Amino acid sequence: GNFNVAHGLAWSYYIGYLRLILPELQARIRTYNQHYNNLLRGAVSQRLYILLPLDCGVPDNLSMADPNIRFLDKLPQQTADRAGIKDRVYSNSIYELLENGQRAGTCVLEYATPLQTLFAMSQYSQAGFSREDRLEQAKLFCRTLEDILADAPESQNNCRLIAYQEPADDSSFSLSQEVLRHLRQE
Amino acid sequence: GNFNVAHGLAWSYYIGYLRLILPELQARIRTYNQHYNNLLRGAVSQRLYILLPLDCGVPDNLSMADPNIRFLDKLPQQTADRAGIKDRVYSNSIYELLENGQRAGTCVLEYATPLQTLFAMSQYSQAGFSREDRLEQAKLFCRTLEDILADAPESQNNCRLIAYQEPADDSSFSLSQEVLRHLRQE
Incomplete structure (x- = not known):
């Protein structure tokens, strides 16, 4: 509408x-x-895990968001710029998920960048964008994203969305646990 | 809607x-x-000239789109990554507008990148996107873009949108002339 x-x-x-x-x-x-x-x-792991924090907060470094998430290595390149598409190549990060000071899992991990736009809009006066507006669009972003992937050819299979929302107060949340749950699941 | x-x-x-x-x-x-x-x-010139081709065609090189448009130099950097925003720095191109084998004007020039998304969608079956759909969204993109700039603080003043549509057949169009007209105007 x-x-x-x-x-x-x-x-x-x-x-x-x-x-x-x-x-x-x-x-x-x-x-x-x-x-x-x-x-x-x-x-x-065999999939790209996409972090979709509904609050649209995207830290420069994952560890700060959680200490139990540690950068391990850069995802090796292919390498081919002219395969047809051009933007390639892309930098991707491999992370180890710590649990009890022990490595519990490992995977290529990253935030959904467009959420930065959402976050930035809510901090821009002319936008007339509130907290709820950001949340509304964040939820919507995930809905339409997964709608797209469903019609995609195996792109959905090489990929997994991790949408989550943290409580406002007395908030006990572990990003690593959230990811691990997903990793462990398969 | x-x-x-x-x-x-x-x-x-x-x-x-x-x-x-x-x-x-x-x-x-x-x-x-x-x-x-x-x-x-x-x-x-003192402004960023943004090419907004309604057909959403974005050539790798401007000269190919028009020979009278020639790359002159890279826009010098500042340079500061941590000014607050980070993405900085950015690569920008200066072009000379030829006319009668003579330099008529010079300015920093570039296409509106998001038009590549529009173009790519129309070439993606699952999108259900037609030529008219692309045009419709292209026109819309310009409308909302200039709506944003109007509320902006002087950002509109350091910037100018060059929206244009080329005829389908027996099409005589000069990109350089279009830009020049704009440059000359002030």
């Missing part, structure tokens, strides 16, 4: 990023696990 | 790019004209 900025954000994210990165994602993780060391087999 | 992907695209473009680049645009052009050579005064 109204403006609904989320719809545009979701499509740009998929068309301009997800669809270009996802196809070769499995291969780049295979390279890290099997072809970057002859003494050990890597155990990096 | 409906999805209207343009609204999101316009806001992301302004919030994530225009608003970060525009503020220091005047200074970077002042640097090129006055502080990059002690033998001559540069004559680069």
Whole structure:
């Protein structure tokens, strides 16, 4: 009905990023696990885990968001700029999920960048954007994003959305646990 | 009413790019004209000219779109990553507008990137996006973009939108002339 900025954000994210990165994602993780060391087999997960914090807060470093999340390595490149699409290549990060001072899991992990736009709008007066407005568009962003992936060809299979909202007060939340739950699940 | 992907695209473009680049645009052009050579005064225009082709076609190189548009130089950097915003710095291009094999004008010039998303959607089956759909969203993108700039603080003053549509057949159009008209105008 109204403006609904989320719809545009979701499509740009998929068309301009997800669809270009996802196809070769499995291969780049295979390279890290099997072809970057002859003494050990890597155990990096097979999917791109996309953090979708409804509050749209996106820290520069994951560890600060949670100490139990630690940067491990850069996802190896392919490498091919001219495969057709061009934007390639892209920088991606592998993280180890700590639990009891012990590595519980490992995976390529990142926030949904468009949420920065959402966050920035709410902090921009001319936008007339409130907290609830941000939440509304954030939820919407996820809904339309997963709607897109469903119609996608296996792109949904190389990818998983981790949407979550933290309580406002007396808030006990563990990002790593949230991710782990997802990793562990399969 | 409906999805209207343009609204999101316009806001992301302004919030994530225009608003970060525009503020220091005047200074970077002042640097090129006055502080990059002690033998001559540069004559680069004072505004960022944004190409808004309604057909959403965005060539890698401007000259191919028109031979009379020639890359001249990179817009000098500031340079400051941590001014608050971070994405900075950004690469920008200065172009000379030829006319009769003679330089008629010179300015920092670039396409509105989000139009690539529009173009890409129309070429994506699952989107259910037609030519007219692309045009509709393209026009909409410009409308909401200029709506944003109007409420902006002088950002509109350091910037100018060049929206244009080319005829389908027997099409005689000169991009350089279009830009020049704009430059000349002031």
